[PDB]
């Protein structure tokens, strides 16, 4: 029984543009979702709170 | 009078509600009974 909020699949997607074994799969996917949420929480907090050159929008 | 065959709540956010529905079917069935009762009050029903 995986927690809800950890089901499905998630991944970070980074882009540059010129513009304005059954349970093993489930537990690996949920752990990957947890780590992607950890990454994006770190990134969004550093974007909002840390003062940097040419600021970002979250 | 009217029967309330299916009531559904369309308001959804998949983050505050932790990847699940915003309102459990228990509470939806409760509101089903409440609006069915106020339909049985037999006023102008659809405004209520």
In 3D space, the residue among A7, A16, A54, A52 whose CA is nearest the CA of residue A34 turns out to be A7
CB distance B18–A4 less than 8 Å? Answer: yes
d(CA B15, CA A10): 14
- Shortest alpha-carbon distance between residue A18 and chain B (Å): 31
Residue in A closest to B20 by C-alpha: A4
Q: Is A46 on the interface with B (CB under 8 A)?
A: no
d(CA A2, CA A28): 11
| A7 phi/psi in degrees, rounded to 5 | -85, 175
| Contact partners, residue B7, CB within 8 Å, separation at least 6 | B28, B31, B32, B35
CB atoms under 10 Å from CB of A12, counted, come to 9
- DSSP class of residue A11 equals -
- Residues of chain B in contact with residue A3, where contact means CB-CB under 8 angstroms, are 18
Asked if A6 and A33 count as a contact pair (C-beta separation under 8 A), the reply is: yes
Asked if A21 and A12 count as a contact pair (C-beta separation under 8 A), the reply is: no
- A23-40 CB burial, b ≥16 within 10 A, e <16: eeeeeebbeebeeeeeee
């Amino acid at each position: 029984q995986i927690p809800s909020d950890l089901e499905g699949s998630a991944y970070i997607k980074v882009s540059i543009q010129k513009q304005a074994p059954h349970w093993q799969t489930k537990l690996e996917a949920a752990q990957n979702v947890l780590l992607c949420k950890e990454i994006f929480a770190q990134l969004s907090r550093e974007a909002v709170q840390i003062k940097s050159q040419v600021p970002h929008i979250v | 009078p009217w029967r309330l065959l299916k009531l559904e709540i369309l308001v959804e956010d998949k983050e505050t509600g932790d990847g699940r529905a915003l309102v459990h079917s228990m509470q939806i069935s409760f509101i089903h009974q409440l609006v069915q009762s106020r339909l049985f009050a037999d006023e102008k029903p659809l405004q209520d």
